[PDB]
Each structure stands twice: as structure tokens, then as C-alpha cells.
Amino acid sequence: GVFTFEDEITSTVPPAKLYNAMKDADSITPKIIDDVKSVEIVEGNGGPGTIKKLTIVEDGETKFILHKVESIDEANYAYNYSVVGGVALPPTAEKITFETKLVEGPNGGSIGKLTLKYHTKGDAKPDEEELKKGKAKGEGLFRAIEGYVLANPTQY
Numbered sequence: 386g387v388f389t390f391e392d393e394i395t396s397t398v399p400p401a402k403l404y405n406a407m408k409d410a411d412s413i414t415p416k417i418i419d420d421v422k423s424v425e426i427v428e429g430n431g432g433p434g435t436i437k438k439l440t441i442v443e444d445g446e447t448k449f450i451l452h453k454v455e456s457i458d459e460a461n462y463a464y465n466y467s468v469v470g471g472v473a474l475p476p477t478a479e480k481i482t483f484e485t486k487l488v489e490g491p492n493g494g495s496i497g498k499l500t501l502k503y504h505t506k507g508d509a510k511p512d513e514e515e516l517k518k519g520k521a522k523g524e525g526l527f528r529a530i531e532g533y534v535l536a537n538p539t540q541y
């Protein structure tokens with residue numbers, strides 16, 4: 386079944402810049418996250434439905450994570466993707482979706498909503514430790530991208 390979790394977040398970066406940076410995560414992520422070595426497209430043009438393979442290092446071991454691009458709403462500053470395979474996917478989960486949606490915040494920044502949707506296999510529910518890890522993945526990426534934009538303000 387489906388279990389949704391939402392976190393509100395803020396940034397001093399305006400939402401157009403963050404949104405462009407999020408759209409370039411394939412490029413940015415390997416540079417700024419040490420453990421991410423590469424992002425490769427398996428099928429698609431980059432837009433919704435595209436399947437990607439991330440190569441990472443975990444505990445000194447090379448591993449893969451599979452992503453699927455879900456949605457892109459430019460108008461609403463929205464970028465959505467799912468984990469569909471690999472170590473970031475718990476065995477009790479079919480998939481975990483990570484949505485990010487931004488609006489204008491006071492004084493030129495952004496107000497964010499990060500959403501995790503866990504599609505479970507059975508009636509089984511996400512446990513607490515797995516929710517922690519999902520939130521850390523979701524927010525960690527958002528903050529990483531944010532940090533890149535704070536360091537390269539003219540780029541986006």
C-alpha cells in the first residue's frame with residue numbers, strides 16, 4: 386500500500402534557482418557527494434519516465450541505486466523521482482518516491498515541501514529506522530543541491 390510523509394523546509398535561495406539545480410542533479414550530485422561516483426541514464430531523454438543508475442560507494446564497496454524520473458512541474462517548481470532498486474530500497478518496499486515542491490518565501494528565498502511516498506509490498510508499513518533513512522536521503526539531497534547553489538549563485 387501507500388504511506389505518505391511530508392516535511393516543510395525553507396531556503397534563502399529563490400525557488401527558480403533551486404529548481405534549475407534540482408533538474409541538473411545528475412551533473413551536481415557526483416561532484417558534491419563524495420560517495421556518489423556517477424549517474425547514468427539507462428533509458429529515456431531525462432524527462433518523466435527516464436530510468437537512471439547511480440553508482441555509489443557504501444562502506445568502501447561499490448553499489449548501485451536505480452532511480453526513475455517521475456514528474457517535473459516547472460510552473461509549480463516541482464521535481465519528483467523514485468528509488469526503484471538497489472541498496473537505498475528496503476526489501477519491504479516496492480519503491481520510495483521523493484517529491485520536492487517549492488514556492489516563493491519571504492525576502493527572496495523559498496518555502497519547500499519534501500514528500501516521501503512508500504509503496505509497500507503487503508500491508509507491511511514503513512518502520513521507524515527506514516523512515517529515518519528515507520528522510521535523510523530526501524532532505525540530504527535537497528540540502529546538498531542547495532549548498533551547491535549557495536556556492537555557485539550565478540550558475541542557476
Ligand code: NA
Pocket residue numbers: 414415416417418419420421422
Ligand atoms: Na562523488
